[PDB]
Amino acid sequence: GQEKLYIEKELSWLSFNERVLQEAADKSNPLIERMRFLGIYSNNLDEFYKVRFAELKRRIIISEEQGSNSHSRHLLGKIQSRVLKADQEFDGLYNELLLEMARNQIFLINERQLSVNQQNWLRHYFKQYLRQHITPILINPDTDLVQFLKDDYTYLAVEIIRGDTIRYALLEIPSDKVPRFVNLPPEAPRRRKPMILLDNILRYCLDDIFKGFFDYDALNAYSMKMTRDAEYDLVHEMEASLMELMSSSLKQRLTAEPVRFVYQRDMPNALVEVLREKLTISRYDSIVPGGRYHNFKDFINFPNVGKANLVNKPLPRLRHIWFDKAQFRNGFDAIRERDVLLYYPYHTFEHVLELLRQASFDPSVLAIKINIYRVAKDSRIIDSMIHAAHNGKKVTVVVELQARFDEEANIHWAKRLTEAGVHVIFSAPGLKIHAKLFLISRKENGEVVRYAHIGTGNFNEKTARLYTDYSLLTADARITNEVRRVFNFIENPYRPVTFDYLMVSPQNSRRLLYEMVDREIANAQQGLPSGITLKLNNLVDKGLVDRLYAASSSGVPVNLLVRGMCSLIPNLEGISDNIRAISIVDRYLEHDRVYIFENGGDKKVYLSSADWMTRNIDYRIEVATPLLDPRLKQRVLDIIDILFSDTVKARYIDKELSNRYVPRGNRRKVRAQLAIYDYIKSLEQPE
Amino acid sequence: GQEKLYIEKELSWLSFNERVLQEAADKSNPLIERMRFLGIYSNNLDEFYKVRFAELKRRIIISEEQGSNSHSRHLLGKIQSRVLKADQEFDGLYNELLLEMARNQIFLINERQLSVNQQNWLRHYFKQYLRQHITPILINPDTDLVQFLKDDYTYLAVEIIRGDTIRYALLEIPSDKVPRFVNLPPEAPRRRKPMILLDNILRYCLDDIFKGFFDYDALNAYSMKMTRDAEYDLVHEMEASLMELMSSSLKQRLTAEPVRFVYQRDMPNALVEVLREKLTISRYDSIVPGGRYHNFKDFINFPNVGKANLVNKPLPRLRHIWFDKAQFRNGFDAIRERDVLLYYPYHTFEHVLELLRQASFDPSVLAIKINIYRVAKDSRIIDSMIHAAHNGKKVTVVVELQARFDEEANIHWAKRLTEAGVHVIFSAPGLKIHAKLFLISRKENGEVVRYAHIGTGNFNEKTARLYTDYSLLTADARITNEVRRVFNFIENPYRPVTFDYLMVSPQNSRRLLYEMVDREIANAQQGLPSGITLKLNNLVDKGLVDRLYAASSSGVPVNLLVRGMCSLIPNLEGISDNIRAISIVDRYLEHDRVYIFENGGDKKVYLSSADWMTRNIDYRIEVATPLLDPRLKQRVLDIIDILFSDTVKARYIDKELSNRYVPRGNRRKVRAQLAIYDYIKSLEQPE
Hints:
The PDB classes it as transferase. Chain A is an alpha/beta fold.
């Protein structure tokens, strides 16, 4: 190690969540929206430790065992140094925001700050609404918190003192059943909006919770929280001579998933100890003191007790007028006529859902093939496939059984189908189909005509609204056959398969990408117009990054738009002098990755679902589509223009991880995510 | 057969549901409440055919096979003659009520009566809300409605006409997902409240549902509904030499559960035929034409678009102040102090639920035994038993696995418990524990003290509110030990067991009842004061009835209050000259049966859960409790007084099944179910 050629993705990520914090600070966002961001920020860091950080640990360990060769503990340090520095910054904001909220007449107060009236109000409220959910868990020598104790929940450790006697009991903050923020009755000026945390209501009612059956001189409560690291598995597909030589002392010290125990700073050491034991806090397990509150994630639902101004105004999802043209009898005619490209959340997912409902009873529809990844809870699509089954249609449904977090939510999504006449097909052990396709075939007088759907993100009717994704609808055989192939590839991957238009992970990808970059590089070494323009969530894969460094050094211009991690360092004398990269963190979540290559003058524009990360190129099922229709190719190009024209949310990506905001020169003030809406909105104006 | 000594229970029942209809007619009830009654009436008759009537069939058949000896087909006739006569009466009311509703500015109109504006309104409404739930089921030669077709749902059979061509398709009225009554926008006077049936919206949009993929000159829709008879099993416990000799032609013709097919009168015979087949309508299956609408049961939720007046005013459930007395530290002290008797729905079930939540963490609570019959969906009691488990408490839970209709809802209520430390105990094949007890033991300084709960109805937190039930809470060992025994009896019934205070079905009952009646009879044949006063839901059991006839003829006075069936004929010269019986059908449902015997002068008062019906005395687990506390014994006596003092809802029971209303002589105007409230209300006034 000498002069960083790339940026550690884990550090790049910290910087990414920091950009998220900038949203909490950014005064241009409504007050309540900023509060909620704090929740996003927290929930992210939460997943950071549960997954990505736990992953890094292992790698650094896997390194050790027999041959660790990366300045790992120097990175670990940098990591927690950025985190601590952040935590103190988080603390600043929360304070600032608390003040600001008060200015707007809202007051998040604690049990000690109650009025000699609200007190009597709470007690009543508690006995009439909360009590039933709050039942002491007694800590006895045989009680084994180990099991029944809820993972990631907040608990209140109660200290029951009677003389030199001390009994211990737990109180679960029921954040699931009851709202975590309760509005107290306005003391004097009816203007004020006072609220208290559910945690502090309990803290305030400890006596009413225990006096009925316990004798004590005093009661003390301290909060604590316990979290387990995520599940491992995909790291042995390299441990050739490693996992083989790897000693049992390391397999046990690598498989065993640790436990993090967090407790309020002033919890009497005796109680901490009591828990250290009851919670099997062994060697590899972590014990950390700190704070009265945990689960700041719960701020993602901070209610809004002010005027609408304090909250973002919801944009109505738009109908793509094309589907409505009276010259179209139905959805299949609209698509047969022209390739249709929808962009969520500006458009309603309601079209794809209408289409699928049609195919389920349209006499001409012969079959339907479609995959169920991480869709919305209890899909309305499932019901449709059932109808199609009941109406004939050869219905084929692929269900992957292990996503990133929405895994066990597709192990039930099956026994049902089969019974009605559906051919169900499960993905291998832990394989992820991050693409979301569906193929529909229908006898259109004599001939069979296939209509496919290629969706960059997933069928989640919840994902369309917080995420921005594409949805291509086509009858173009060039693309149609390719989707058909994809589904075949899934059912029988043992059989050789090739794709001429789609980029399919992990069949081509690497090859298909290297090859496109290598061509721009070629045209650049010939002085022709070249260009690489990517819009990804993460740019990390070693190979792909170097491939870009190469493009830059060969004169090829590269414009990146990565909202998350970016191990690529832009502006490196002789390495990446022609690579400009920014990040836009706004309301919505980018779920759509694009690829745009100059390819001489005839630009190739791909809509993908994969980030330039190793796991997305070589280990999961991903799909990227070229836009054969120049009309649609253009639309995507405009949108990408609005994006790179942002001067409100865009930030620079530098080898300094500064997250500075792109300055608006004499150029216009643009906020992509909003301009994008007006762009779409203008497309749906009566022809 | 000559001079009916008893009344056929099936006829008595028809008369009972007729009393229910009288509620729909009774102008003293708010308009919307009367509408909803029509639904009750319908839902009842619905269950009448699914169960009781299907049961009678079998008996009459079981009679046949080798030896049928009851004027069965003479009864069948009487049965459907009362039903037809009723149906025509039902029709009258509905019409009258429809008129009355209009007077109040409400108009339930059909698709043909829409305005040339609401039409355009519906279509829009349909495409934006209903469409997604309405997907044509195409009827093809291979389609087998047989399976996937929903039982008891309403379907619209659509006729697609194109030349001399006719295609058939089904449309399911989605009463489960969408409200069955939609409010249309007021045409001219803003006063009017126009609404249409969901069935008729479809009927009106047939074109918008099919034009997209079908070519036709016309579309016709006709409603139909299919119902299956309930499940059989408890009739072979007598077929000694019967079931044995019984021929396979009868076991097959007796087990096989028929299917009832109902269709709109004018459905083209071709379509009826199409369905006769698709629906495997075999021999024993029933096919019946009639009406545009089915499922009148859906009227139990008829919305109220008028002023509160049109709906019954909800009485707030009262706290039993006794549990609140400051001299009581907790629930166990209130009960240890005095036997506590709660009467629902006047009181909140909230006490029993508070008590159970305490026992789950009260250090002195050692164990808890309790049964899970037909409780409310996802019990809050289950969670409590889990805590108790987690807190030590030897928790024992009995789960019967087959109730009358809430059966499979207790097959899941288990795997959960065991895991946490709960001793689960399942009831035999099809055994019903219609009692609802729980025993709690707690070390009260040295000694162990048991507190039991004896509930006449079930733990259903839904049942407490439409039903009127008792709930006795006591620490009296005389009763405590007896409950303890009950639970033991359940766990090990193979072991001999005896009860000295509780009436337990089917251990004593018969004996315990015969014996009490026989004693009054004795005191009556000695000129002493005797009396039998029952409050039941049904008085049918042969033996018990004759036992009463005997009491009457021996001079013993008998006062019956049966809301449902009553095979006993009151006022039979020389048979039942001293038996006065009435029925009160009001808002609430009687789920509390009492028993009261004069017993010399020292009256015995029992609170039971069993009706005087054979299945409740000899085949199910029932529990009746004597009221050892004279204070509580008195309260029940007052309530029973208010009841028999009713002169608003009380009806006479006669051998004419006239359902005449008890006339208010110069006596006061009383409405028990309301007076009962004021009685309780007065008991909870600050001491």
